Design a protein around this nucleic acid. Sequence first.
RNA 1: AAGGAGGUAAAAAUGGUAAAAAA
RNA 2: GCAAACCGGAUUAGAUACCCGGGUAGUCCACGCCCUAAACGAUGCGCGCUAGGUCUCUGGGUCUCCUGGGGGCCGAAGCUAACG
RNA 3: AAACUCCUGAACCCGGGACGAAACCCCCGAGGAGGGGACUGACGGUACCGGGGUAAUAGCGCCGGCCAACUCCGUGCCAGCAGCCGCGGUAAUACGGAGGGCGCGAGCGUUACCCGGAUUCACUGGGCGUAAAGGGCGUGUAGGCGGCCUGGGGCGUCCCAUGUGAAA
Lengths: 151, 138, 100, 208, 125
Amino acid sequence: DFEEKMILIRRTARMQAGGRRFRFGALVVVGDRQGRVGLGFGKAPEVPLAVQKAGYYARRNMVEVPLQNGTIPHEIEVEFGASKIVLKPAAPGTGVIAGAVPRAILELAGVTDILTKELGSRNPINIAYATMEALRQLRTKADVERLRKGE
Amino acid sequence: MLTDPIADMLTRIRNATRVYKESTDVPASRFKEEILRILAREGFIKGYERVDVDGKPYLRVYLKYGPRRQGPDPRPEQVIHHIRRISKPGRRVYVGVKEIPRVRRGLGIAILSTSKGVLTDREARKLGVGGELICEVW
Amino acid sequence: PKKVLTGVVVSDKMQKTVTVLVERQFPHPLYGKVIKRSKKYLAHDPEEKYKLGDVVEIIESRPISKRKRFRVLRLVESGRMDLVEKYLIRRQNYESLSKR
Amino acid sequence: GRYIGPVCRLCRREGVKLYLKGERCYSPKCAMERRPYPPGQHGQKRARRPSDYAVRLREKQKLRRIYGISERQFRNLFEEASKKKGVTGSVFLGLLESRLDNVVYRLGFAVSRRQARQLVRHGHITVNGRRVDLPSYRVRPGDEIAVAEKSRNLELIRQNLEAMKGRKVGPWLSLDVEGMKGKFLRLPDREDLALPVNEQLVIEFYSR
Amino acid sequence: PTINQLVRKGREKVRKKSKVPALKGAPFRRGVCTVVRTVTPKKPNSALRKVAKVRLTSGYEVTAYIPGEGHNLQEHSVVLIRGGRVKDLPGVRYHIVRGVYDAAGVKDRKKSRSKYGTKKPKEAA
RNA sequence: AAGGAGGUAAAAAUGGUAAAAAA
RNA sequence: GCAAACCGGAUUAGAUACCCGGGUAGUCCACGCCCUAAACGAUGCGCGCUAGGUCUCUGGGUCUCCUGGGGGCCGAAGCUAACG
RNA sequence: AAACUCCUGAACCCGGGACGAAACCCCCGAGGAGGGGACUGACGGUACCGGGGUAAUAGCGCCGGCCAACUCCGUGCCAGCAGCCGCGGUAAUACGGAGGGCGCGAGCGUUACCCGGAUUCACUGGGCGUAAAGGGCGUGUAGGCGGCCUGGGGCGUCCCAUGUGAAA
């Protein structure tokens, strides 16, 4: 019981010898609502194809979510080259104040109080990627205790 | 040469961290000794000692690593995530009490030299004494 | 109180009065870094007793004449040929910046 | 003014019913069950894709519309909500529910919003002594909504008090079908009055 | 720029230019005018647009437009210098109002009565 | 003899033709 | 010897141009004066750190090797929007 | 929604009715503290208290995407909207009209002005191989900043006290 929450659609033509052939790109984000997510872009001639296949790539491109009440446990300045996603902690009741893909992905993680600013290239592709790696670079007290105990 | 054997050290650190090479060397000084003191002292490096190369006193530093996971390549994660030299020889930061960062808001560490010696975020705020803001690390 | 300050002596050349380059410094209220700053004052020398360098602690007193403010109460040291040299070097680099 | 007129035309507009008008818009339709769905020449013509922001705005509306007031003062008291201390959202909800008019209504004296606000601005309510008009009057823990002396000998006031006896008031709504009063107790929560609305939507929205 | 150079110099403020010198704080002015004509916007139009030259009560021969169909305007009107260019008439800046001292909107308008003149369409029925 | 790269010689008689545009 | 400008020649619809015949400024020698550029590695300078495989030029060592300094290519990590 | 229904009762009629003002003053005490009596309303008989009682103003932008909301005729690159990108060149969801609806409501749009978004002069928070950019290059003045070790200094720096930072 995930959630196929489509983000948007892209239309990519290649200039046929006798015309032009577009193809659908399905930017999809898959959640669960409590704390698991995955990302996928669909690559297909007609829309639904792309949507489903995308949803499926989101299905296998997974990642966990550490929640405290409903916020981040710190502050990350993540940068997928072009884009630059930045998250900062907020108190309960604040709401999910974020951009497009930020709040989408994060509500498929089900955040509740996250101050988020998004800088640089706001290109939805690299935005999704930067986001995914921002939460894929989420450290917590637990993970701290692992390595900051010393092996 | 060198303008900051300190920040240069921090850099060689960043090398060994980002390259995964168990240990790395960095010349003789009392202050580096204080810093690396703090570093082991919060479970980060693997240690230090006053060594020597060619006849020149140095200070070698071994460092910490995590577990080797599979799937997306074998690359294990880092322990000494990142350190940033704050008070450059142009931005001579001088934090005090009510000042002081929070570093990753909760965890991390601030390294700062005060009236008495080399302190840390939580320490220096607990102490109630401040000074220059060296690096940040988490 | 009455503000005083130390400073490097410049020009004995005035009769019974000298000039003194004072130094202060401060960071940038928005751009970190401290900045070195020069500011000469009127070193009041009733019994002409300071010369070409003589760092002295100088005293803000009752007005003496045109801009004639400050004085001296006590001395620090002598023969500041170095800092004074830099002073005259600046003046030289001034006499090397023509628009004509 | 505060809209009025084609009201439970709003009931259908959201996609969820809202008593709003008692008796009938509470009966076999809040304009609903007959023909419930957003009004107009369109309406029942294939629902679409309202952006996240859109159903967010809608949530905001929805909320202000069940709270028979202007979105003006809805907003104003929202500002007042994030102003002082408290859990922004749920507290905001509470701050809405603490207003004299809905207090008079949910007490039972009124059978829904419009009637209620009429009665309230008609100064028929005496809290700790004084008859107050001033519909946007939020009381305080340690006060009590009463009815006027001649407003005891009153038609559908009595009819209300009659078709009410047995209908349990809120946990912070103290009833008094004897002294003809209504203690404003504690400070209620989304669990006390759950309306088809999300808090963080209205927040995130308003706090753009 | 390494802190030092930044301090020695300065990162100058953008400044503006006002793409709209209605000037004095006066974007409301007494459009005296002269001529009418037509003119065209790029490759897909052709219309009218006046030229109202205005003189304000400070100067300039501008290009004062009009709020559209329903005209009179002849040569005075007090064309109320307003503001807003488009891909039409190399100017379209400082529009007209209708109402002012003249024009008072389209003979029968049912919407933009906030400049297009007509009061309150009381059909008295 | 594979590729890729690094410097030396090869190779066009002639060409004017536009355009608001259709998806 | 060469060669802009300049003339003949042939070419084309035109040839003030490329191809051919002559021919000058100038390209050389010294003093001076101008100071420009794709002055191009389009990459400032100084240091320290971070895989190696190689072709080659100079400095040192008994030398199928090492080591100082440089000069082509490759490719860890890393970086870059991409080529790189 | 209207009409029909019952209810309440803005506006409005009559009546009573302010706080805003107790000091100054004479007097007993001494001209002091105290104690007494007396004067003092511009608003305005307005606030407001009681009773009598009538349903009793509705607009402004929009409906192409940004930015929430569509159907119908006309118009035919003409008339025209237009912050941006454009929309119309005879089946316009963008013009103009009409039903509906989105918003806002005693206000709604329009322009002007400023701050933001603009991290788009970047301190937090940018860049110089090819998009904007190395100065053709060597010299060095000042200036800028500076390797290991000890001790003095306590200028920068940190800490507690502290004067002032009025009021608003």
